[PDB]
Amino acid sequence: DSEMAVFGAAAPYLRKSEKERLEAQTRPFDLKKDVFVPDDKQEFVKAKIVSREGGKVTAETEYGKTVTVKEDQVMQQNPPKFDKIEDMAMLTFLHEPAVLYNLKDRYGSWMIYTYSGLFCVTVNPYKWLPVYTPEVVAAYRGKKRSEAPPHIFSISDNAYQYMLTDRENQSILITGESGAGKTVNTKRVIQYFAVIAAIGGTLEDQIIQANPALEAFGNAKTVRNDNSSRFGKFIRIHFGATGKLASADIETYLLEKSRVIFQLKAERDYHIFYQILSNKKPELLDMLLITNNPYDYAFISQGETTVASIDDAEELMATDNAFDVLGFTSEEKNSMYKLTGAIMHFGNMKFKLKQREEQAEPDGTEEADKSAYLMGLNSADLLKGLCHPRVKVGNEYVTKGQNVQQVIYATGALAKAVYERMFNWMVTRINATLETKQPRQYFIGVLDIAGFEIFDFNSFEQLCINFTNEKLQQFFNHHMFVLEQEEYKKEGIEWTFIDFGMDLQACIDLIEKPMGIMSILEEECMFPKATDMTFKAKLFDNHLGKSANFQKPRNIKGKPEAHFSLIHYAGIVDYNIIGWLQKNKDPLNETVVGLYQKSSLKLLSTLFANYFQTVSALHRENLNKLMTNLRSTHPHFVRCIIPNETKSPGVMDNPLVMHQLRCNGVLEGIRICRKGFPNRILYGDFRQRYRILNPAAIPEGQFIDSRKGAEKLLSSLDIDHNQYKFGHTKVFFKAGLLGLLEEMRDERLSRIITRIQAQSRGVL
Ligand SMILES: Nc1ncnc2c1ncn2[C@@H]1O[C@H](COP(=O)(O)OP(=O)(O)O)[C@@H](O)[C@H]1O
Ligand SMILES: CC(C)n1c(=O)cc(N[C@@H](C)c2ccccc2)[nH]c1=O
Ligand SMILES: [Mg+2]
Numbered sequence: 001d002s003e004m005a006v007f008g009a010a011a012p013y014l015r016k017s018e019k020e021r022l023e024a025q026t027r028p029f030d031l032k033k034d035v036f037v038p039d040d041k042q043e044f045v046k047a048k049i050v051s052r053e054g055g056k057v058t059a060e061t062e063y064g065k066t067v068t069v070k071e072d073q074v075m076q077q078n079p080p081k082f083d084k085i086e087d088m089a090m091l092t093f094l095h096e097p098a099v100l101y102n103l104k105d106r107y108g109s110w111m112i113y114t115y116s117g118l119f120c121v122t123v124n125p126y127k128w129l130p131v132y133t134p135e136v137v138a139a140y141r142g143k144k145r146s147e148a149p150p151h152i153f154s155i156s157d158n159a160y161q162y163m164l165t166d167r168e169n170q171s172i173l174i175t176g177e178s179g180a181g182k183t184v185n186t187k188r189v190i191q192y193f194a195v196i197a198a199i200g201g202t203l204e205d206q207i208i209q210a211n212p213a214l215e216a217f218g219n220a221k222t223v224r225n226d227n228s229s230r231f232g233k234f235i236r237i238h239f240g241a242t243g244k245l246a247s248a249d250i251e252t253y254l255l256e257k258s259r260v261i262f263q264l265k266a267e268r269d270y271h272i273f274y275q276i277l278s279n280k281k282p283e284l285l286d287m288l289l290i291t292n293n294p295y296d297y298a299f300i301s302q303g304e305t306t307v308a309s310i311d312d313a314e315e316l317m318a319t320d321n322a323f324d325v326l327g328f329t330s331e332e333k334n335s336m337y338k339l340t341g342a343i344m345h346f347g348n349m350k351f352k353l354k355q356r357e358e359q360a361e362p363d364g365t366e367e368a369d370k371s372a373y374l375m376g377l378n379s380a381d382l383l384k385g386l387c388h389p390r391v392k393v394g395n396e397y398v399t400k401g402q403n404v405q406q407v408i409y410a411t412g413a414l415a416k417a418v419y420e421r422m423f424n425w426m427v428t429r430i431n432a433t434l435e436t437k438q439p440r441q442y443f444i445g446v447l448d449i450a451g452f453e454i455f456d457f458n459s460f461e462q463l464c465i466n467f468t469n470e471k472l473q474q475f476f477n478h479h480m481f482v483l484e485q486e487e488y489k490k491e492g493i494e495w496t497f498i499d500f501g502m503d504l505q506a507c508i509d510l511i512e513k514p515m516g517i518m519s520i521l522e523e524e525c526m527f528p529k530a531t532d533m534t535f536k537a538k539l540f541d542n543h544l545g546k547s548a549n550f551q552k553p554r555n556i557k558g559k560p561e562a563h564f565s566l567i568h569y570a571g572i573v574d575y576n577i578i579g580w581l582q583k584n585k586d587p588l589n590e591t592v593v594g595l596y597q598k599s600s601l602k603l604l605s606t607l608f609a610n611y612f613q614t615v616s617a618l619h620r621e622n623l624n625k626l627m628t629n630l631r632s633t634h635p636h637f638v639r640c641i642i643p644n645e646t647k648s649p650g651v652m653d654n655p656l657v658m659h660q661l662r663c664n665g666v667l668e669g670i671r672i673c674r675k676g677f678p679n680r681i682l683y684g685d686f687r688q689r690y691r692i693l694n695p696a697a698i699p700e701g702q703f704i705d706s707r708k709g710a711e712k713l714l715s716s717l718d719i720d721h722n723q724y725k726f727g728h729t730k731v732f733f734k735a736g737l738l739g740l741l742e743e744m745r746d747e748r749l750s751r752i753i754t755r756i757q758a759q760s761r762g763v764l
Contacts, residue, residue, distance in 0.1 A: 003147075007139045010131045013110045014149040016084055027080040034077040035059060036097035037067050042654035044097035046077065078102075084109065086150050089117035089673050089735055096658065099667055104652055107643065113150040116666055117673030117735060118480075119637035120155055123657070124181040126649035132188055137195045146739045152185050152638070156192040156444075159636050163442050164243050171445040171633040175472060176640030177570065177660065178224040178451045179647070185638060186235070186448040187211050193237055193444070197245035203436055206326055207237075207248050210430050213322035216275065216315070217423050218252070220259055221268035224453065226309045230256035230270070231423075232449040232468060234626065238440040246438040252427050253449070253468070253626075254619055256461045257416040258583070261347060263303035264457060271315065272340055273300045278312035287334065288341030289370045299347035299415065326433055335603035339422055342374040343415045351387070351404050359401035360387045376600030382592065386410060389591035409582075410589045417588055418596075421607040445633060447472075452570045457560050459576055460583045464619050466568055467511050470504055473569050473664070475627055476637055477502040480669050484676060491727025493677065500672070502665045504569055507549040515542055517550075518616045525585040525614055536563050536577050570663050584614045639664050677725060677732035683710045686731055692752075693717060693744055717744070 001018070004011040011017075016024075030048075037047040037059050047059040047067065058068045075095045082091055084105050091098055099116075106114055107123045114121045131151065140153035144161075148154055159170040172189055176182045190211065194204040215227065222228040232253035240246045263269055276284050277294050285291055294305040323333050349371065350363035362368060362383045372379035387407055388399050402410065449472060450465040458466075481500045488495035510516050517539065524535045543550040549567040553574050562574035588611070596608040641660050643652035661667065672678070681689070683706035691698055694716050698709040710731055714724060719741070723734040733741075 008133075008135050010129075010133065010136050010139075013129050013131050014151065015111070016109065024080050024083040027083075029077075029080050031076070031079055036075045036077060036095075036101070037061060037069050038073065039067075043658040044075075044100060044654070046101070047074075049074075084111065087115040087117065087145075089115070089670050094667070094670060094674060096661070096667055099661060099670070100654060100658055103641070103657070104654070107652055108650065110650070111149070113152065113154075115145065115150050116639070117670045118678050119639065119669060120150060120152075121639045121641060121666060122152070122176075122181055122185055123641045123643050123652070124179070126644075126647050132191070134195050134199075137192055138199060140192070141196060141199070144739070144742060146743060152188045153192050155636055155638060156189045159444055159634075160193070160239075160243070162634055163239065163444060166634065167442065169443050169445070169633045171447065171630055171635045172638065173447050173472065173475070173630075173635050174638045174640060175449075175469075175476070175664065176451050177642055178222065178228055178453050180451060180640035180642040180660075182448050182451055182640045183219075183227065183229050185640060186233070186446055189446050190235065190237070193245055200244065203245065203247075203434065206433055207245075209322040209325040210248070210250055210434065212319050213326055213430065214250070214252070214427070216272045216319035216322070217270055217419075217426065218255060220256075220270045221304065221307045221310070222453075223266050223455070226307055227271075229448065229450055230259060232465070233447070235446040235448075236443045237446065238443045240439055241441045246440040247436050248434045250427055250430055250434070252424075253622055254461070254464055254615075255420055255423050256450075257420045258459070258461060260343065260416050260419040261299045261412045263300075264455070265303055267303050268305070268307060269300045269303065271310070271312070272319075273297075273344065274305060275312040275316040275319070276337065276340065278306075279316045281316065284337060284341075288337060288344075288374065290341050290344055297344040297348060300344060326430055328429065332429075332603065335601055336422055336426065338374045338601065339418055339604065342371045343419060345370040345374070346411060346415050349383075349411060351407050353404055357401065358403065360404045360407045362387070374601075375596075375604055377595055381595060385591040385595055386589065389589045391590070410592070413586070413588055414592055417586075417593075418604070418607065422603070425603075425607055445630070447630075452568075454571060454573055457576060458562065458573055459578075460580045460616075462573070463511075463517075463566075463575060464616070466566075466570075466573055467508075468619075468623055470508060470511075470569055471623060471627060474504045474508060475630065475635070476669070477504060477665060479635060480665070480672055484672060487680075487730075488677065488727075488732070491730050491732070493725050493727050493732055495676075498672075498675070500665070500668045502668050506547070507566070507568065510543065510547045510549050510566075512620060517543070518620060521580065521584045521616050522614050525581050526612075530581060532577050532579070532581060535581060539564065539577075571659075584616050586615055637669075639666055673735055678735055679733040679738040680727075680730045681733070682730055683707050686710050687713070690741060690745065693741070693748055717741075 001015055004015050007014055033048045035047050035049055036044045039045045039061070046062045049057060049059050051058050055071045056068060057071055057074045058066065059074065061067055075097060076093050078091050078093055078098055085091070085102065088094070088099055088102055091102070103114055103121060103123055106112070110125060110129055112123050112125050112129070137153060140148055140151060140157055142157065143154070145154060145158060155172065159172055162168070163170045174182050174185055190207060194207050198204045215229070218231045219227050219229050234251045234253070236249040237245065238247040238249070259269060268274065274294060276288070277290065290297065295301045345367045348367040350367070351360045352363035353359070354361045365379070365383065368383050369379045372382045387402055389402070390397055391400055449468050452466055452469040453462055455462060481502050485495065485497055489497070511518055513519065520535065520539055520542065524530045524538065544552065551565040551567060553562040553565045555562060561576060563577040565572055565574045593608055593611060596604055599605045641657055643657055645653070645656065687698060687706055687709050690713065694713055697713040697716050698704065707726070711726060714731070715721060719737060723737040725732045
């Protein structure tokens with residue numbers, strides 16, 4: 001394309017040049033001979049047929065191996081004009097290796113985005129490409145998918161075009177495992193709308209800073225990613241009737257609060273703890289009494305304290321500035337540092353047994369003094385209330401003396417709760433900005449849940465995020481395959497139902513329903529003498545041999561102990577039950593929480609102002625609230641693919657990519673676009689939009705039924721009359737026909753305006 005000059009230096013990474021296009025069309029190729037054949041180490045390899053034995057085929061691979069395969073299992077290659085094409089729905093042969101090798105060949109030229117009919121696939125580059133500069137934001141503005149190469153800016157503007165045209169709320173549903181590119185692609189959508197609203201500022205910059213401010217406190221280094229978002233996020237970008245940006249809401253779903261006090265080896269705590277320390281920043285290490293290196297503050301010192309990909313000194317100032325731009329006042333910004341400083345000291349407190357009483361006493365009090373000073377508490381009351389809490393059972397009060405191991409747990413639970421409530425506060429404080437009281441009518445909702453994880457030790461939080469991913473997959477499955485085909489039968493289109501097999505309700509019912517895994521947790525936390533082995537027994541008794549997705553654990557040697565295994569969509573996940581009743585119930589020491597309410601630090605008193613509704617129950621209802629509100633939107637999906645486990649750029653592993661293409665239903669999602677009628681318009685809206693293509697077809701002032709007008713109009717265009725169908729109230733278009741009708745509309749808008757201009761000369 002000669003128009004690629006508007007994309008500047010980004011152009012080689014968005015489209016192949018015409019110099020490369022002429023090489024593609026001049027490849028040696030025989031349509032009868034060039035085929036894909038399966039292989040073990042890499043899922044499919046290109047091959048050339050050398051002989052035929054009826055239903056058996058034998059072929060020579062790209063790597064010179066001989067192979068023999070059955071005729072149902074060998075799949076024709078696309079001819080070389082379909083090299084690296086931008087939308088895989090337009091291929092002539094559509095199958096697994098056609099999608100695999102089209103993505104691999106685009107990614108090998110660093111064209112990381114590809115369309116898949118109605119949705120887009122993103123393959124993670126471990127290299128910052130220049131395709132995201134604000135000249136490319138300008139270059140994507142108002143271009144259609146028929147024009148511009150695929151990009152996250154294309155999806156953003158396409159959703160924005162639907163929002164204004166349909167007058168319907170839109171959503172961008174970004175999906176993928178951990179390490180896939182979900183968070184930066186979220187940021188680019190947020191960058192796109194902000195810069196477009198700047199090209200038209202304070203709200204535009206603040207919306208951009210809202211991400212790195214939350215990343216300091218909400219992201220952490222994990223084995224799959226150095227910047228894993230330990231919280232799910234939904235961003236509603238709000239627009240007015242004229243389409244200009246008007247507000248944003250951030251909502252966050254479930255922070256991994258156990259990370260605050262516990263980390264596995266080979267992973268970090270949250271970035272905030274290490275970035276304060278690693279700059280050795282003179283003001284913060286004196287104000288927070290945290291003078292040391294990180295290996296002595298117990299809560300953060302386990303795991304890894306340094307990561308090569310992150311220069312914590314520069315990331316500190318980036319997020320310190322982020323809170324400045326978001327208008328956190330000096331006392332607020334200092335206070336939220338103070339609580340992170342206190343939490344570091346709060347894990348160093350030492351307790352010992354009193355010599356006869358089976359009761360804890362403080363062993364060392366210097367680190368409690370530091371904690372109480374920063375938290376504005378009284379240190380004597382803190383240590384007393386931590387060891388000897390008052391508990392009440394109606395009007396009866398009694399002191400229960402804590403043992404040394406369970407006062408340590410009480411310090412852990414309090415440290416988690418301060419951090420969680422401070423992170424929740426910070427979100428509400430970011431949403432105190434960004435709400436600008438400008439009027440709004442529509443939103444585009446960008447979702448970036450915590451992606452799917454399989455660790456060497458999976459716990460209750462890994463269950464919550466993997467459940468959240470499975471629900472969002474079933475949202476895709478229901479929208480693409482069930483709700484789509486219901487509308488064909490509802491409108492009376494000649495359609496016979498196709499079973500794609502993409503259904504997950506058996507595994508969601510195993511978790512959600514009132515006898516499922518989480519429903520056992522909400523009652524087993526209520527019985528005071530229940531235990532984790534009592535839970536595991538009741539869990540197995542209800543589900544082992546009664547749900548196909550609930551299996552016995554497969555403990556391989558060397559890996560830790562796991563107590564059951566779930567057959568999730570993205571893979572089998574083995575879960576350890578220890579602590580789940582405590583984690584679900586979340587009992588805080590009410591005496592020390594009473595000290596927190598009386599804190600001199602204005603933040604800490606606010607966090608615990610106002611403190612049956614277990615965290616699994618809250619999660620399930622927040623997630624069910626989300627997807628009911630999400631069904632009231634037009635969804636755009638972005639499939640983020642991690643190509644490679646080792647994080648090395650441009651390297652791509654075919655089994656790991658194919659696993660993600662299969663379980664995300666990518667091939668099926670294209671097939672319903674090719675087979676079905678993916679575009680459709682009400683006859684009233686069709687007449688409203690496209691009468692300009694042939695104004696003589698539908699003469700107005702006479703009454704005409706909307707169905708009767710549209711049926712006449714569509715025959716006169718000289719588009720293919722087989723590419724559309726008529727329903728009771730909608731016309732239904734095949735894959736490419738709306739893209740053709742829009743191009744026909746824009747050239748006819750261009751023709752009429754230039755002739756209006758010609759008349760504006762003709763009057764002179
Ligand atoms: N589009 C991209 N361009 C450049 N680097 C990327 C891109 N997508 C991902 N990466 C690399 O992968 C890292 C992790 O991606 P991220 O979005 O944080 O993962 P997740 O999908 O788990 O949210 C990024 O910080 C960066 O190093
Ligand atoms: C995704 C699909 C179901 N669809 C369409 O196929 C057309 C829609 N509306 C028309 C009026 C339109 C045409 C061109 C650009 C934007 C919107 N809406 C839609 O929702
Ligand atoms: Mg993330």
